[PDB]
Design a protein around this ligand. Sequence first.
Ligand SMILES: CC(C)CCC[C@@H](C)[C@H]1CC[C@H]2[C@@H]3CC=C4C[C@@H](O)CC[C@]4(C)[C@H]3CC[C@]12C
Ligand SMILES: CC(C)CCC[C@@H](C)[C@H]1CC[C@H]2[C@@H]3CC=C4C[C@@H](O)CC[C@]4(C)[C@H]3CC[C@]12C
Ligand SMILES: CC(C)CCC[C@@H](C)[C@H]1CC[C@H]2[C@@H]3CC=C4C[C@@H](O)CC[C@]4(C)[C@H]3CC[C@]12C
Ligand SMILES: CC(C)CCC[C@@H](C)[C@H]1CC[C@H]2[C@@H]3CC=C4C[C@@H](O)CC[C@]4(C)[C@H]3CC[C@]12C
Ligand SMILES: CC(C)CCC[C@@H](C)[C@H]1CC[C@H]2[C@@H]3CC=C4C[C@@H](O)CC[C@]4(C)[C@H]3CC[C@]12C
Ligand SMILES: CC(C)CCC[C@@H](C)[C@H]1CC[C@H]2[C@@H]3CC=C4C[C@@H](O)CC[C@]4(C)[C@H]3CC[C@]12C
Ligand SMILES: CC(C)CCC[C@@H](C)[C@H]1CC[C@H]2[C@@H]3CC=C4C[C@@H](O)CC[C@]4(C)[C@H]3CC[C@]12C
Ligand SMILES: CC(C)CCC[C@@H](C)[C@H]1CC[C@H]2[C@@H]3CC=C4C[C@@H](O)CC[C@]4(C)[C@H]3CC[C@]12C
Ligand SMILES: *[C@@H]1O[C@H](CO)[C@@H](O)[C@H](O)[C@H]1NC(C)=O
Ligand SMILES: *[C@@H]1O[C@H](CO)[C@@H](O)[C@H](O)[C@H]1NC(C)=O
Ligand SMILES: *[C@@H]1O[C@H](CO)[C@@H](O)[C@H](O)[C@H]1NC(C)=O
Ligand SMILES: *[C@@H]1O[C@H](CO)[C@@H](O)[C@H](O)[C@H]1NC(C)=O
Lengths: 344, 344, 344, 344
Amino acid sequence: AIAQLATEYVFSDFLLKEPTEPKFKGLRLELAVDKMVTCIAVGLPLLLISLAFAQEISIGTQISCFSPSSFSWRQAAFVDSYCWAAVQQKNSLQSESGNLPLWLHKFFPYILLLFAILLYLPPLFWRFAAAPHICSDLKFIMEELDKVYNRAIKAAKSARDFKYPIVEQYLKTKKNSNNLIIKYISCRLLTLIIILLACIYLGYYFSLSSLSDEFVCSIKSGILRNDSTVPDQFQCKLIAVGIFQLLSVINLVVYVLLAPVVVYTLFVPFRQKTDVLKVYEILPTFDVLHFKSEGYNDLSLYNLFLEENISEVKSYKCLKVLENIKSSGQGIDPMLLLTNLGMI
Amino acid sequence: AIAQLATEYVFSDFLLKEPTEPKFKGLRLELAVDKMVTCIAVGLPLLLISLAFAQEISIGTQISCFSPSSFSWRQAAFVDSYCWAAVQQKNSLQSESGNLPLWLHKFFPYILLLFAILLYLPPLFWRFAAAPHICSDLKFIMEELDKVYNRAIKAAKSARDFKYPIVEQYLKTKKNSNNLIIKYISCRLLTLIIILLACIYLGYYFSLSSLSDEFVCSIKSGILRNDSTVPDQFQCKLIAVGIFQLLSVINLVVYVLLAPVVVYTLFVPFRQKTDVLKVYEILPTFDVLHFKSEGYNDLSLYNLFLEENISEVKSYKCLKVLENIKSSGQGIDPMLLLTNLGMI
Amino acid sequence: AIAQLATEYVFSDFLLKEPTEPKFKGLRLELAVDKMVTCIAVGLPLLLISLAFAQEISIGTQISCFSPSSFSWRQAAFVDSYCWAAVQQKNSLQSESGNLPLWLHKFFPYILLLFAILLYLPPLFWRFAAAPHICSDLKFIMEELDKVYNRAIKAAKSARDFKYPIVEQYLKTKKNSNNLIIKYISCRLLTLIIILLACIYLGYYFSLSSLSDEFVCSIKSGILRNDSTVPDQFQCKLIAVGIFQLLSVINLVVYVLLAPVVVYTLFVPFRQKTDVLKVYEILPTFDVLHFKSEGYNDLSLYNLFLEENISEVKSYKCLKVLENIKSSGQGIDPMLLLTNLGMI
Amino acid sequence: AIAQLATEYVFSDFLLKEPTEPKFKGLRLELAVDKMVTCIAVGLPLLLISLAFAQEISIGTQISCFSPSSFSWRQAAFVDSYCWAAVQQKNSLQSESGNLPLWLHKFFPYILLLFAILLYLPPLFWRFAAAPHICSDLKFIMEELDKVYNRAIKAAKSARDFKYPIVEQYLKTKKNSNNLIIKYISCRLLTLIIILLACIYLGYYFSLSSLSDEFVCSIKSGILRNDSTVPDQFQCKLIAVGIFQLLSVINLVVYVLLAPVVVYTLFVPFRQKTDVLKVYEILPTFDVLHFKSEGYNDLSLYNLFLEENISEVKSYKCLKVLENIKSSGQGIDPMLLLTNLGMI
Ligand SMILES: CC(C)CCC[C@@H](C)[C@H]1CC[C@H]2[C@@H]3CC=C4C[C@@H](O)CC[C@]4(C)[C@H]3CC[C@]12C
Ligand SMILES: CC(C)CCC[C@@H](C)[C@H]1CC[C@H]2[C@@H]3CC=C4C[C@@H](O)CC[C@]4(C)[C@H]3CC[C@]12C
Ligand SMILES: CC(C)CCC[C@@H](C)[C@H]1CC[C@H]2[C@@H]3CC=C4C[C@@H](O)CC[C@]4(C)[C@H]3CC[C@]12C
Ligand SMILES: CC(C)CCC[C@@H](C)[C@H]1CC[C@H]2[C@@H]3CC=C4C[C@@H](O)CC[C@]4(C)[C@H]3CC[C@]12C
Ligand SMILES: CC(C)CCC[C@@H](C)[C@H]1CC[C@H]2[C@@H]3CC=C4C[C@@H](O)CC[C@]4(C)[C@H]3CC[C@]12C
Ligand SMILES: CC(C)CCC[C@@H](C)[C@H]1CC[C@H]2[C@@H]3CC=C4C[C@@H](O)CC[C@]4(C)[C@H]3CC[C@]12C
Ligand SMILES: CC(C)CCC[C@@H](C)[C@H]1CC[C@H]2[C@@H]3CC=C4C[C@@H](O)CC[C@]4(C)[C@H]3CC[C@]12C
Ligand SMILES: CC(C)CCC[C@@H](C)[C@H]1CC[C@H]2[C@@H]3CC=C4C[C@@H](O)CC[C@]4(C)[C@H]3CC[C@]12C
Ligand SMILES: *[C@@H]1O[C@H](CO)[C@@H](O)[C@H](O)[C@H]1NC(C)=O
Ligand SMILES: *[C@@H]1O[C@H](CO)[C@@H](O)[C@H](O)[C@H]1NC(C)=O
Ligand SMILES: *[C@@H]1O[C@H](CO)[C@@H](O)[C@H](O)[C@H]1NC(C)=O
Ligand SMILES: *[C@@H]1O[C@H](CO)[C@@H](O)[C@H](O)[C@H]1NC(C)=O
């Protein structure tokens, strides 16, 4: 039913499932905006496919040819099925709009499924190629941040009663390499191109005259070519073509609204803001150097992933509340850190 | 069946599922009133869609055109399907009420699903954008309250046998920022606007003459335009239009009753009452300062979320019972706190 | 529905399920490229089979013979079923394209299923014959790497405050044996041959005239051979043949794009690059000798499997970050290793 | 659907499920070749049964008798059902090929299911009679091997810083008894005989003229015997007989390819090679005596089961890597064993 389709595709965790494995425990591995874009671009065409053939919106068979009254039920069924299979056969049918509109009307669900698959492909390539590496690197970075926070609080407590910046060096090294950012931009660009092509196709499909679904059909090949009792042609109409056009314009609207989001996603350096690591600069055990901005490198992408999935880090949360309290400046950062006692 | 739909949509945890993740363990992340509003506004139109096409209420096909007796079954089926697809084609049909009523009668389930999706969108935006931040902040606040309660009871026990207000400073800082409250008000306002538009549409749909479902249909395009055996027109009726109007007025009543709730929700400062933190003011380790009221800021929203999901805090429950006992004044707050022995 | 099939076969973990057993905990046991190739080559033909007979794309029965009007419904049904069963019987039918096109049109789903099974066979043979051995060997290798890393860090810590290369000897011994690599190459080659044969078949099927689906059928055997009221022949058409050809060309395109991937897979020594063990050469407890390249031996395959599933090793990750930091050369490898404190 | 059947029967763990009980944790209890043979011989005929009546390959009803035009739909249905039930009644029908072909055409699914059940019977008898005993014995043997390995490594460590061969005596005793091997050979031989009988039946079924499915049917018993309006006979055809023959030849090919595998399985002593226990002979605590070869006794079968499910033993894996390293001979077996430190 329509409501069942809605529950499956919008109100359920459709493509929102976290990786089912212990390797990525709590790691999104995909930005929220990218996940939203993929979920829409994939589950919208599927939802429209399901809707267009819902038991309520669908009168019945997808084509009716209006055989003569003399024709029996199965003769008329032969006519309808023959014309359905003959939309491909150009000789059989003669339609003013041509044969491409008939092809599109017959295979619209296939085309929507193709667009959905093509849009799901780049996210899958990301999740299967560049996701494990970033997951491992980000897990190491979070562990290092937790360890340095613990060491700093232990030092502060000892004072009240190595020291090498490994994480900073690793981030600096990531500043050079750009394979991950190149893959990310390539997959986003392919998604954008697929969306644009889908918009072109949907606009063309919705621009039809709405009468191209009606085509003339001739079961006059073979032994029936010279038969007399059979009329030279029939009036066939492809039902649900109006529904297809409505859903196609809906998908076109959604995709044109979505494309600016993908373009904004492509410009990762601009998105790289609100320095996540700036909060850690007040730790004595952490060097006061952010050095993450203004670069078409994997460093900006790692900064984005950190700003996305750093809320799960207790040390980061503690430092964030310390920073927020520092806005008033009533107290002292080391005193607040010592009082917090948030090792684990 | 009707009962199955009821069990799925009203008697089950439809959209009442808690976040399936360890990050939010026991945190609602959504006020009870907001959750009720979203659940109604989403699962009502879906329930009505399912009901309108239930196997019992539905006689059968959604349109019947009453072809002549001479017409065969599949000729009549062609007529019915053609008219169903031609509700869009204005030239084919001539109805007194126009063609918009026919469009609405055909696509009412789609319109209800659209309203449900549009009403579910703002809650989803909230849960995916502003929910993680408030979850982390509120978890930190609850942990701080538990820790300060434990410290105060330990101090009392030591007396019988830092001290910095970090949580108060954090709340004071939240008094300034307003991004969360702005997002909350924006999503509530969008929900209200969607509800009002849905009410307008449902009132228009229910105000129809009830005879607009009957339209005249002409299969007279193409080779059949000059055919003689076919009548110039047919009498088609869109079945289930009365059911659609009944369910639409039901949804209109529900939404007009719900809109005052959304308006009341918009005025969060008025809702900010029954100070949750007032109970903690009797703790020696906690400063006697509430400072949370009369502000279009995130502080009021945090106060609401606390008053919502603070019952899970054992320290808060203990302080609440101490406060309630203090109404009589027979005993002493520190003595009762020491006797409680409710560290964990 | 079409969307359900898509969810099952592309958006779900179809053939992507990890081995359901404690023996292989986190071990892929199959390279990512090989898994992708198998998943495509298997779940594409199945998806096309499901699509070709979807409730929306399918008009109805797969063959209609257009019995005379005098014929009753069940007489026409007998004609259609007889011709469906007589596509095999060459005498009954006379078609210009022959009888092989009719066989193919009738049994296309069977042929796609056969290709899917034949393509799934070599992966299954691998997973049931050569997977347990490589799993055990690789688990031992990872355990040895973890143990040597722990020993080296313990030695470094002791200095700050046996020694036999068992793993290197085992890898060197693997350099000689080649049964695993021979099995891998044989299964890949069989997969490639099956893909090529499938491409040949699909090209032949798509090269048909598109009118071979229309064949002449004669129910004139037995008592009906000399019957007069029955016409000497009927015009039968195999519906969905156009859909079969469309999906067959789609599968042909996918398989021709996939075959280069399989050919590249066959050349494992070229794939053996980015020495995984090179990072471990900086450990005092590990001998400085890689000795893994330029060989049609199981050593290259083991190197590939290591480069695939070594990210799960904490010691390997730590050594990798040490290597990446060494690019700048600011610090010292032993000092960084001591500071890391990543025993477990 | 066809793809669903494929997923259930070839791509899923059909009859590949490990024993669902804690008694056999990780013990196959069935050789890989035997499991493959059983899985094929059982799930192939079931798959063919499902395929032959798939919603796509099946035109409709399994028999059509071509009643006269004067006959009504339910008169024709009576004719078809009567002939379907009268394939057994020899007097009613007169077919050139006889009545056995009609029996076979009607009950082919039953015959395939019978063959599948008969082939599944011997494996079930094994798993319910001789599997628990071998499971217990093999678990004891693995535990003894682990214990002796632990004792030997402990002795080596003590030197660096009872002694009775219980397992060897148990294996020697198993050398005498042969009940398990006799049961194994009997079940394999019964499986082979069932496969041969199935091949005979399938060859006979596929050797039919392909026109035996067409039989003459006479509804002329009872009050209708002397009725005039009813024709003396009808032309009935059993649909799907061609599909049955195709699938039967497929099953015949599979079974003839499989029978050599079963014959090779029967010769267990030849399969008994690559002495698993030879690796343990280098342990000081283990006597240097294999004494397992060249015997129609349970010892060879136990050797096969060990070679199958010994990879799960850490001590065996360690000894195997020690053996492989000994190929070069660079080091010493006791030194390598001491350095390994693989007690558990
Ligand atoms: C997804 C991508 C590939 C879709 C590409 C656009 C498709 C949907 C449409 C939009 C405009 C279309 C073209 C418009 C006009 C003509 C001229 C005609 O004489 C032949 C077909 C041809 C050349 C059409 C082919 C298909 C076409 C290119
Ligand atoms: C992503 C955005 C830009 C998509 C907007 C849809 C655009 C591309 C659509 C809307 C209307 C469409 C046009 C409608 C009609 C025709 C006439 C036909 O003979 C050739 C294609 C052509 C000229 C179409 C080309 C594509 C088109 C311009
Ligand atoms: C969800 C929102 C967009 C719904 C908006 C209201 C819809 C349901 C209805 C209510 C009143 C309607 C209008 C009433 C009268 C007319 C005048 C007529 O000559 C053209 C249509 C037009 C202009 C209608 C368009 C659709 C309309 C605006
Ligand atoms: C949220 C609350 C206010 C909704 C209450 C429903 C109201 C808005 C409904 C109920 C009856 C409706 C009217 C019924 C009939 C017509 C005549 C038509 O030619 C134009 C629209 C118009 C004038 C409708 C406008 C909307 C309407 C006034
Ligand atoms: C999967 C593998 C086995 C498929 C092999 C190719 C199949 C699909 C096709 C492609 C070309 C075909 C051949 C083309 C021409 C002829 C000549 C004709 O007089 C008899 C059939 C015969 C000999 C065909 C047999 C089937 C054939 C070989
Ligand atoms: C893997 C790649 C190479 C596959 C590409 C498809 C090729 C092999 C296909 C496409 C068109 C096909 C041809 C189409 C028509 C005929 C005529 C027929 O009488 C014999 C087979 C023959 C000659 C086919 C042989 C195979 C063919 C050449
Ligand atoms: C599974 C086992 C039992 C199958 C045994 C073979 C079956 C399928 C077939 C193969 C050959 C067949 C026989 C061939 C010829 C005749 C002679 C005829 O006048 C009576 C039936 C009889 C005697 C057939 C009986 C059934 C038969 C034995
Ligand atoms: C396991 C292997 C050997 C099976 C190979 C199938 C063999 C046994 C099949 C293939 C063709 C079959 C023959 C086909 C036709 C007839 C004629 C009939 O009047 C008696 C049975 C008889 C003589 C069949 C006996 C069995 C048969 C020889
Ligand atoms: C049909 O009859 C015409 C008469 O002109 C003839 O040309 C044609 O070949 C016939 N077709 C068939 C299929 O017999
Ligand atoms: C139908 O016949 C009329 C007669 O006036 C003619 O004008 C019209 O073009 C014909 N239509 C078709 C589709 O042939
Ligand atoms: C049909 O009648 C013809 C007349 O020539 C005869 O040859 C043939 O044998 C008959 N067929 C049957 C099945 O009785
Ligand atoms: C049918 O009529 C015949 C006439 O010869 C007679 O012999 C036979 O008994 C009748 N059968 C029945 C069932 O009445």
